[PDB]
Scaffold this active site. Sequence first.
Site, mmCIF file in Angstrom:
data_model
loop_
_atom_site.group_PDB
_atom_site.id
_atom_site.type_symbol
_atom_site.label_atom_id
_atom_site.label_comp_id
_atom_site.label_asym_id
_atom_site.label_seq_id
_atom_site.Cartn_x
_atom_site.Cartn_y
_atom_site.Cartn_z
ATOM 1 N N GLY A 99 -14.117 -6.663 -3.905
ATOM 2 C CA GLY A 99 -12.685 -6.544 -4.159
ATOM 3 C C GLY A 99 -11.968 -5.557 -3.246
ATOM 4 N N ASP A 118 -4.707 -15.302 -16.380
ATOM 5 C CA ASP A 118 -4.466 -13.852 -16.249
ATOM 6 C C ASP A 118 -3.030 -13.518 -15.838
ATOM 7 O OD1 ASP A 118 -5.071 -11.110 -16.504
ATOM 8 O OD2 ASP A 118 -6.302 -11.026 -14.697
ATOM 9 N N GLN A 175 -8.453 -1.617 -3.084
ATOM 10 C CA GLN A 175 -9.927 -1.540 -3.124
ATOM 11 C C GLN A 175 -10.478 -1.806 -4.530
ATOM 12 N N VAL A 177 -8.171 -5.540 -0.397
ATOM 13 C CA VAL A 177 -6.996 -6.298 0.082
ATOM 14 C C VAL A 177 -6.273 -5.633 1.259
ATOM 15 C CG1 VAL A 177 -4.763 -7.311 -0.559
ATOM 16 C CG2 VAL A 177 -6.603 -7.295 -2.224
HETATM 17 N N1 LIG Z 1 -0.191 -11.619 -0.789
HETATM 18 C C1 LIG Z 1 -0.121 -10.297 -0.962
HETATM 19 N N2 LIG Z 1 -1.051 -9.592 -1.601
HETATM 20 C C2 LIG Z 1 -0.618 -8.333 -1.572
HETATM 21 C C3 LIG Z 1 -1.127 -7.195 -2.064
HETATM 22 N N3 LIG Z 1 -0.433 -5.987 -1.875
HETATM 23 C C4 LIG Z 1 0.739 -5.945 -1.200
HETATM 24 C C5 LIG Z 1 1.426 -4.736 -1.022
HETATM 25 C C6 LIG Z 1 0.964 -3.562 -1.639
HETATM 26 C C7 LIG Z 1 1.666 -2.364 -1.468
HETATM 27 C C8 LIG Z 1 2.828 -2.322 -0.688
HETATM 28 C C9 LIG Z 1 3.289 -3.490 -0.076
HETATM 29 C C10 LIG Z 1 2.596 -4.695 -0.243
HETATM 30 C C11 LIG Z 1 1.271 -7.130 -0.691
HETATM 31 N N4 LIG Z 1 0.547 -8.309 -0.903
HETATM 32 N N5 LIG Z 1 0.865 -9.497 -0.532
#
Ligand SMILES: Nc1nc2cnc(-c3ccccc3)cn2n1
EC number: 2.7.10.2
Length: 251
Positions: free
Chosen positions: A22, A121, A21, A24
């Site tokens: 933008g 970045d 948490q 995902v």
């Molecule tokens: N493409 C992408 N972007 C992300 C962002 N976070 C994760 C992730 C974050 C925590 C545990 C497992 C996977 C996995 N991904 N894969």
Amino acid sequence: LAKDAWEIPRESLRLEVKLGQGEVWMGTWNGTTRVAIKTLKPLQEAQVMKKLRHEKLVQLYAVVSEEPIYIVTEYMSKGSLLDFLKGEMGKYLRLPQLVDMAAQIASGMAYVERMNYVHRDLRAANILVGENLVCKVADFGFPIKWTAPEAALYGRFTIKSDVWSFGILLTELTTKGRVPYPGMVNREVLDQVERGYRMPCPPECPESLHDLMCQCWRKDPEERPTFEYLQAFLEDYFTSTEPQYQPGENL
Ligand SMILES: Nc1nc2cnc(-c3ccccc3)cn2n1
């Protein structure tokens, strides 16, 4: 206005677990394949993630070009390199695994170097990890500590300012995820680094790898190595550079 062939139906995606948490999410695309879905708050110019395709860059799958804008990509099962190195795995990683990871990242960046692009970045929080220690450069979307001086001070972002960052990233791997310039705040980094300060050799890190860091941190960006040189150095490291490497306490 006209979409391209990356566009997919707003709701051809099933969001499930939230992961950040933008924002995902993990999800499922057309009920068959697992994806990651980065959502924006109010992809216009993603003509960057569209043109790049390489095995060490997180692959773009699709976009959605209306608020809320979606970006769908391959799922990286371990999340960020930063979290991975700071979590339960950090204590078991030794130099061979960390140098191998560095090599993968240099391989993605050497591709970026060929295509004449610039990341801007590069840091461990923007490398993603999958099974079998696969690392992949992500997020072509203030980290002064990771930025070359000419870029922090004068907005001169080149592939050579990426190299600088890659060198900071190498201290992240060899320290299992520590913030660089330990004890220093942003301003003191900028002042110290302009006067010529460089982070010293991290505990148990071999000199030959610290020299590599130092070359990436040269003042004249033109004298900084290429990623092609970095990839080749890292791949061959335990034969060509440190053939007598002995595992130690932490590395
Ligand atoms: N493409 C992408 N972007 C992300 C962002 N976070 C994760 C992730 C974050 C925590 C545990 C497992 C996977 C996995 N991904 N894969």
